[PDB]
Design a protein around this nucleic acid. Structure first.
Ligand SMILES: *OP(=O)(O)OC[C@H]1O[C@@H](n2cnc3c(N)ncnc32)[C@H](O)[C@@H]1O
Length: 646
DNA sequence: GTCCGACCACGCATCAGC
DNA sequence: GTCGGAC
């Protein structure tokens, strides 16, 4: 029928009757755009999941081969994360394509996008570039997804202009609300309120209600008909856990969907299983606000405390044939990034180890003084085509978990077992491969000292993980089974800074209409200057951000004050009269390549910025001259234990 | 608690304009 | 990475 009247949120949805395309025919992108419209219209995740599940139900029964692109479009993903596909399209490039497609000037389009905080609204309500053009053939979901991959594949010189032509071709073919969601997808801000967890929930519910592998018309279109309310809830929850645990071990829709469409959800765990060479989703941590909050949530359950090393996570896979692969926490292939780790793998395990998967942290290590180097030194390593002899920043590994060992997966094993197998089958080599500094006890006085020792030993804090009660590696049960105890989480850390607001930035998405970010500055007394130190975008409540936008709008200046120095920082949208002083908390102080704050007091050509800055409260009693000085900022950077360790 | 999406610094890798 | 909001 007509995809313009598609309603996937209809009460009592028939996957075949309520669809807007014939069987065997490509799924129209308008059907996807209409589904995105009903999803964004609501705020309850349970209602959003059922709406997406209705689209997926119509897809599996009518056009199975279009299920993969529809899922990728709903996730705003280009493919499996280990393939490293990236659009390579910035906001300015997308805005240039919008202005050219709609026939408007670039400045008019850029002003509307900034004032509306969304490029999708600007790209949709502009049907002037059509001029005298008959409507192009309607967009399909698989065709739109194929164009996205085409844009991501374009590289080399003059590739930006070729990306614009493809984006322009999509816009002139967009009808109704299609332009809003393609521009949102290209900008990386789909803004649906639904993401990976809800897509997985909608997928398992769709294949459970409407099973795949059926002949059309489908004999079974709603497998929850003769079921009670509690019986259907527990059935769908049990089905959603089968898919989630499989995806947690194999986060690859290119591997899961074809197996899902041929054998069903119940046969999935026997075809897709955690194997070396295939990256898996890592165990995440929950921020804890103190020791006492660690004793809660865990309750009467024994746990271990380990050093939280400040580096990069390295998921190292050893295949049965001998090949070695390393993956980031985003399942990105980092094998070519660590040629040293590959050549060192012989010295970390004993001969009777054939295959494994370790969960380690690659930390920048120095062999000259035998000390841990900060995270900024680690990020100076090359990313690809690294020659082993050209490595200038050595790396020491800190293993803390074992997922695979000699052909068997230890995902369903307690940490006590996985840790015990780690120390038995692996040898420690200082400066290269060492076990995470651990400690198993309950004494609060002992734990508090371990937190101080970790910071003294160049670490962010402590990681708290149970040993036997809910101590498995099953992400699908709880993604954040571990706890992180960082010092800067406490109430009396001391690393608070009183900074002056010198600029504001127009907000986007949730922050559209008001300010999304602010420019902060410290006072340099000798130069009589306000030197920008960092930007601030988190820590405000929604009510506080409304008060800030109202009160700071009276201080808006057309030009910056002569004593304000920002150097290389992003020029604020609204220059502000220096008056507001805010207390700001951070985790560390970093040597900045753009920020001029305290430049010349610790480094000759580099200033200081803030690591993980967040807003705390307004300092009404303070004035811009009473704010933190650049001398205090330089003294704070020198007092950092990692800086003192050199 | 869960899930989602606002926002932060930094530096390698990449590309347009010249 | 931190953070707050809707459920
Ligand atoms: O703050 P965050 O979510 O990045 O912390 C989690 C990450 O911290 C790293 N890390 C460092 N030390 C450990 C130990 N001992 N155990 C687990 N993770 C650890 C990891 O990279 C982790 O993803």
């Amino acid at each position: 029928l007509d995809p313009s009247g598609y309603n996937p949120a209809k009460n009592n949805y028939h996957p075949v009757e309520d669809a807007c395309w014939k069987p065997g025919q490509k799924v129209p992108y308008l059907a996807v755009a209409r589904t995105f419209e009903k999803i964004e219209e609501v705020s309850a995740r349970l209602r959003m999941v059922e709406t997406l599940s209705n689209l997926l139900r119509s897809v599996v029964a009518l056009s199975p081969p279009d299920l993969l692109p529809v899922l990728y479009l709903s996730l705003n993903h280009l493919g499996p994360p280990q393939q490293g596909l990236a659009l390579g399209v910035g906001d300015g490039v997308l805005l240039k394509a919008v202005a050219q497609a709609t026939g408007r000037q670039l400045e008019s389009v850029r002003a509307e996008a900034a004032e509306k905080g969304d490029v999708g609204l600007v790209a949709e309500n502009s049907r002037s570039t059509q001029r005298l053009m008959l409507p192009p053939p309607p967009l399909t979901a698989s065709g739109v997804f194929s164009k996205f991959r085409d844009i991501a594949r374009l590289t080399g010189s003059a590739s930006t202009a070729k990306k614009i032509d493809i984006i322009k071709g999509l816009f002139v073919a967009c009808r109704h609300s299609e332009a809003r969601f393609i521009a949102r997808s290209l900008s990386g801000r789909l803004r649906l309120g639904l993401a990976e967890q809800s897509v997985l929930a909608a997928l398992s519910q769709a294949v459970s209600l409407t099973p795949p592998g059926q002949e059309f018309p489908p004999a079974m279109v709603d497998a929850g008909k003769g079921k009670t309310a509690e019986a259907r809830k527990t059935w769908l929850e049990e089905q959603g856990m089968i898919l989630k645990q499989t995806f947690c071990e194999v986060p690859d829709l290119d591997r899961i969907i074809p197996v899902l469409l041929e054998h069903g959800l119940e046969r999935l765990p026997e075809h897709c299983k955690l194997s070396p060479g295939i990256p898996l989703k890592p165990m995440l941590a929950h921020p804890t606000r103190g020791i006492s909050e660690v004793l809660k949530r865990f309750e009467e359950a024994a746990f271990t405390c380990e050093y939280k090393y400040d580096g990069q996570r390295a998921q190292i896979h050893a295949l049965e044939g001998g090949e070695v692969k390393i993956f980031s926490r985003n399942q990105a292939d980092n094998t070519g990034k660590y040629p040293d780790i590959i050549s060192r793998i012989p010295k970390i395990k004993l001969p009777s180890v054939t295959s494994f998967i370790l969960d380690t942290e690659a930390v920048a290590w120095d062999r000259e003084k035998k000390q841990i180097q900060p995270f900024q030194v680690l990020t100076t390593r090359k990313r690809k085509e690294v020659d082993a002899s050209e490595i200038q920043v050595q790396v020491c590994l800190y293993a803390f978990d074992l997922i695979y060992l000699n052909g068997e997966s230890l995902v369903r094993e307690p940490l006590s077992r996985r840790r015990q197998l780690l120390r038995e089958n692996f040898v420690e080599t200082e400066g290269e491969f060492v076990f995470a500094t651990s400690l198993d006890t309950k004494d609060i006085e002992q734990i508090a000292e371990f937190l101080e020792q970790s910071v003294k030993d160049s670490c962010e804090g402590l990681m708290v993980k149970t040993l036997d009660v809910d101590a498995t590696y099953e992400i699908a049960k709880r993604s954040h089974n571990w706890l992180k105890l960082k010092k800067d989480y406490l109430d009396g850390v001391g690393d608070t800074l009183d900074l002056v607001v010198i600029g504001a930035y127009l907000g986007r998405g949730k922050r559209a209409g008001r300010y999304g970010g602010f420019l902060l500055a410290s006072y340099d007394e000798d130069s009589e200057e306000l030197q920008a130190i960092c930007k601030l975008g988190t820590g405000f409540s929604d009510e506080e951000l409304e008060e800030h936008h109202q009160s700071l709008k009276a201080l808006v200046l057309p030009s910056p004050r002569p004593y304000v120095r920002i150097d290389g920082a992003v020029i604020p949208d609204h220059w502000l009269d220096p008056s507001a002083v805010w207390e700001v908390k951070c985790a560390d102080l970093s040597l900045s390549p753009i920020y001029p704050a305290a430049r010349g007091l610790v480094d000759s050509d580099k200033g200081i910025s803030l690591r993980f800055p967040r807003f705390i409260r307004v300092r009404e009693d303070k004035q811009p001259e009473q704010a933190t000085t650049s001398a205090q900022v330089a003294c704070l950077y020198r007092k950092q234990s990692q800086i003192q360790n050199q």
